[PDB]
Design a protein around this ligand. Structure first.
Ligand SMILES: CNC(=O)c1cccc([C@@H]2C[C@@H](O)N3c4cc(C)c(C)cc4N(C[C@H](O)[C@H](O)[C@H](O)COP(=O)(O)OP(=O)(O)OC[C@H]4O[C@@H](n5cnc6c(N)ncnc65)[C@H](O)[C@@H]4O)C4=NC(=O)NC(=O)[C@@]423)c1
Lengths: 133, 666
């Protein structure tokens, strides 16, 4: 009902190998070629990504900045208020980025800010200006 | 098996149902009540037992019925019918037995037997014990046919048959109790040896062997599951099928390699796309760093847009610094995967050049068994007789297998050096025309009621005919003759003055440097008491080594043996015999094989007797006159001695039924 284990025989397979007198060496010799071209295609890309690893010598260690470990406050000094309105203009509703800029406010009171100070800082208009970007 | 049941088995009979042949002789019993069939079967098996348990004395019907018990011995005609059926068809009282009843003073009918091979001899002994007058015509100066045995001094070696294939159901078991035969078991340990001269490593032998066995099953799969039995309007041979299996394994290796490296590219490129992401991101991080740095250069106090711009670039830069770190994990997660894949690659080849040379040895062994190159064996049928294999070890005959025919010939009218040239068969009888092989001018004419041809198939195949049939054989017969296969297989007997090989191995192998010569001196046998090695020439090598002189052949044997045992342990041989069975005009081969395009049915065609036409037109349909036997005529046990013998036993019965009547069918 099934071939011995470790033996591969397919109805499909046998006709292609038997169809002419040389169909065996022909079928076999495409695959030696298909193997050698993939092999040379490997050593190609193996050398292109060699180059790109050298363009990345040292990673980005010099360009890194130290962590700003800053306890989260709750009151809104005018300074952190004006930083806010500018981030809204640069970041839309990504309130994580905006919470990162201002530093000492968590993502919820950024949401809260959007509503309490919504009238006075005229946030609606700012967001429309950001949309045009 | 044991009991009356073991007797049925040891006579190739099922204990629990009746054969077609008993159905023919006992149609009353078969079609009758299930209980009566059972009584018959016990009577058969019990009588078979009584014979087998002692085959050096005739088993008389009276002796039979006395060891029987009620209710089995209540019916004497059933017992007398069964015993006579068994006697007539050579299941009991065959071979060399002492006759309780001396044979009738005067004989009935006259049979000429062409050939005193084992099949001829077995028929002649049966017919003569049935009360017929029997003469055998033998072209050679000796009996035995293809059972040839070399004898010089105490050197003894078989040039023909030498192996008894296991006593479980084998009539040669009976013959062995009858004629003393020093039967020695064959140890199946066969150490192989490369052309370099050194042994094959034990891991390698077992790989290649098992691949050989797996390759065979695969052809079977091709044959019975994929109906790949005709290709280009021609029947597929075994060898064709093996190539196609080998090529598909070779193909599937290449398919695995391609699929492997095709994963390597599909990740090297997923890496490439990752590194181009990390160049173009590091160059953004260069640029934001400069920008953040300049913005940090504007000294405080700063208006709020300038403070936003520091704090903004700082967020933006740590953001890109995180994408570059996440990517550097993904870079790390692809780098080891490439290392893992590269270090677990699939198999480089299917079989190395050394591998395929050891596999070619196993193919030579198989070409040996079937006495022909595998490109001639029918893929569908080459193994049609494996179901009737006997149980037990194979054996050899230390004292020479000629002792069997020589013994059968005791008491028989045999005309040696008598070659048949024409066989004439007509409605009233037959006349066989033979010459003397020494001087061919002397001509003899033998007249008889029936001829039993046991001419080897290679002789019947000969064009132009060695033997002429008058009238010619019908097309259905001559076509079976053309379709069948007659193979070829030779031996080199090497006679030394001292043992220089391992005495504990019966047989050892030589691996050929090429496929074409895979059969050339590929195997050696230590079967005898005296220092004799015996070397086989199988496959396509058999027919070609026959145009090579003895000395050149014995040279190549010594060469191969030097490489095994060192150039100084091999003496020059004292005696050397080289067989050439395809050259032998009374053989013209070694034995039959199921050719591609043929089938087991041809073996039954070969066995059908010939009935001549009527002498006077409108006269009644005559008797059959020309009968056939020998190894090429027994479907289930072709190409062996036990099969030859069985075919003689069966023609004797068929001929006796025809010419003495068969009173046991009422
Ligand atoms: C598929 N095969 C397996 O499964 C199998 C299985 C197990 C073992 C074997 C082996 C193989 C080998 O290792 N051995 C063997 C070796 C050789 C070299 C040879 C040559 C044979 C064997 N036989 C076969 C065995 O030999 C034979 O098949 C029988 O012997 C045949 O006998 P028969 O049919 O009577 O024909 P003859 O040819 O004998 O008789 C005819 C008479 O006609 C005379 N004659 C001709 N022309 C004329 C004329 N014009 N006028 C008058 N007479 C004429 C002629 O002179 C002769 O006298 C083997 N079988 C074994 O069992 N054991 C072995 O050991 C094995 C294989």
């Amino acid at each position: 009902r099934k071939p011995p284990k470790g033996m591969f025989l397919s109805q499909e397979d046998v006709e292609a190998v038997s169809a002419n007198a040389t169909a065996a060496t022909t079928v076999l010799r495409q695959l030696d070629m298909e193997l050698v071209s993939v092999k040379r295609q490997i050593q190609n890309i193996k050398q292109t990504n060699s180059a790109l690893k050298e363009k990345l010598d040292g990673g980005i260690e010099p360009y890194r900045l130290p962590e700003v470990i800053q306890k989260c406050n709750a009151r809104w000094t005018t300074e952190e208020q004006l930083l806010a309105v500018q981030a809204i203009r640069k970041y839309g509703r990504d309130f994580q980025a905006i919470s990162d800029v201002i530093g000492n406010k968590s993502v919820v009171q950024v949401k809260n800010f959007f509503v309490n100070y919504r009238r006075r800082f005229n946030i609606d208009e700012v967001l429309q200006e950001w949309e045009a970007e | 098996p044991s009991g009356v049941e073991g007797a049925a088995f040891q006579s190739r009979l099922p204990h629990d149902r009746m054969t077609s042949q008993e159905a023919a002789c006992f149609p009353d019993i078969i079609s009758g009540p299930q209980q009566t069939q059972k009584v018959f079967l016990f009577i058969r098996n019990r009588t078979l037992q009584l014979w087998l348990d002692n085959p050096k004395i005739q088993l008389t019907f009276e002796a039979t019925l006395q060891q029987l018990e009620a209710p089995y011995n209540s019916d004497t005609v059933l017992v007398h019918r069964v015993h006579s059926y068994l006697e007539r068809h050579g299941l009991i009282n065959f071979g060399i037995y002492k006759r309780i009843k001396p044979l009738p003073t005067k004989k009935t009918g006259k049979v000429i037997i062409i050939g005193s091979g084992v099949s001829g001899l077995a028929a002649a002994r049966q017919l003569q014990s049935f009360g017929m007058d029997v003469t055998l015509l033998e072209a050679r100066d000796r009996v035995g046919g293809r059972v040839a045995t070399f004898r010089k001094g105490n050197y003894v070696a078989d040039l023909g048959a030498m192996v008894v294939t296991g006593l479980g159901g084998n009539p040669m078991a009976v013959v062995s109790k009858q004629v003393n035969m020093e039967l020695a078991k064959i140890k199946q340990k066969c150490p192989l040896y490369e052309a370099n001269g050194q042994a094959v490593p034990k891991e390698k032998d077992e790989m290649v062997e098992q691949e050989f066995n797996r390759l065979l099953e695969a052809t079977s799969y091709l044959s019975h599951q994929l109906d790949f039995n005709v290709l280009n309007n021609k029947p597929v041979s075994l060898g064709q099928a093996l190539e196609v299996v080998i090529q598909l394994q070779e193909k599937h290796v290449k398919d695995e390699q391609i699929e492997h490296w095709k994963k390597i590219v599909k990740t090297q490129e997923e890496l490439k796309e990752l590194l181009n992401k990390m160049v173009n991101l590091k160059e953004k991080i260069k640029e934001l760093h400069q920008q953040y740095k300049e913005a940090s250069e504007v000294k405080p106090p700063r208006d709020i847009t300038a403070e936003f711009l520091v704090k903004s670039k700082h967020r933006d830069l740590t953001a890109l610094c995180k994408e570059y770190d996440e990517l550097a994990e993904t870079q790390g997660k692809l780098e080891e995967k490439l290392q893992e894949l590269e270090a677990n690659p699939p198999s480089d080849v299917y079989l190395s050049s050394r591998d395929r040379q050891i596999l070619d040895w196993h193919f030579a062994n198989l070409e040996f068994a079937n006495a022909t190159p595998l490109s001639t064996l029918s893929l569908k049928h080459w193994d049609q007789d494996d179901d009737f294999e006997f149980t037990g070890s194979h054996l050899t005959v230390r004292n020479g297998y000629s002792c069997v025919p020589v013994a059968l010939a005791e008491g028989l009218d045999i005309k040696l050096n008598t070659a048949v040239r024409q066989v004439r068969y007509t409605a009233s009888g037959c006349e066989v025309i033979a010459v003397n092989t020494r001087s061919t001018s002397q001509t003899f004419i033998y007249k008889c009621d029936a001829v039993l041809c046991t001419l080897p198939l290679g002789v019947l195949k000969q064009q132009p005919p060695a033997v002429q049939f008058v009238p010619p054989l019908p097309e259905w017969k001559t076509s079976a003759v053309q379709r069948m296969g007659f193979g070829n297989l030779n031996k080199v007997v090497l006679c030394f003055d001292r043992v220089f090989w391992d005495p504990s191995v019966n047989l050892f192998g030589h691996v050929g440097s090429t496929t074409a010569s895979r059969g050339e001196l590929f195997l050696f046998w230590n079967l005898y008491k005296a220092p004799i090695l015996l070397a086989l020439v199988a496959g396509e090598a058999a027919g070609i080594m026959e145009n090579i002189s003895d000395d050149v052949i014995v040279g190549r044997c010594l060469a191969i043996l030097k490489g095994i045992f060192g150039s100084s342990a091999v003496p020059q041989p004292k005696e050397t015999v080289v067989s050439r069975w395809r050259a032998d005009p009374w053989a013209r081969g070694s034995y039959s094989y199921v050719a591609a395009g043929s089938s087991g049915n041809d073996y039954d065609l070969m066995a059908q007797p010939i009935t001549p036409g009527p002498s006077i037109p409108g006269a009644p349909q005559p008797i059959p006159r020309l009968f056939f036997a020998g190894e090429h005529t027994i479907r289930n046990y072709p190409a062996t001695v036990h099969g030859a013998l069985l075919s003689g036993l069966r023609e004797a019965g068929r001929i006796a039924d025809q010419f003495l009547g068969a009173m046991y069918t009422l």
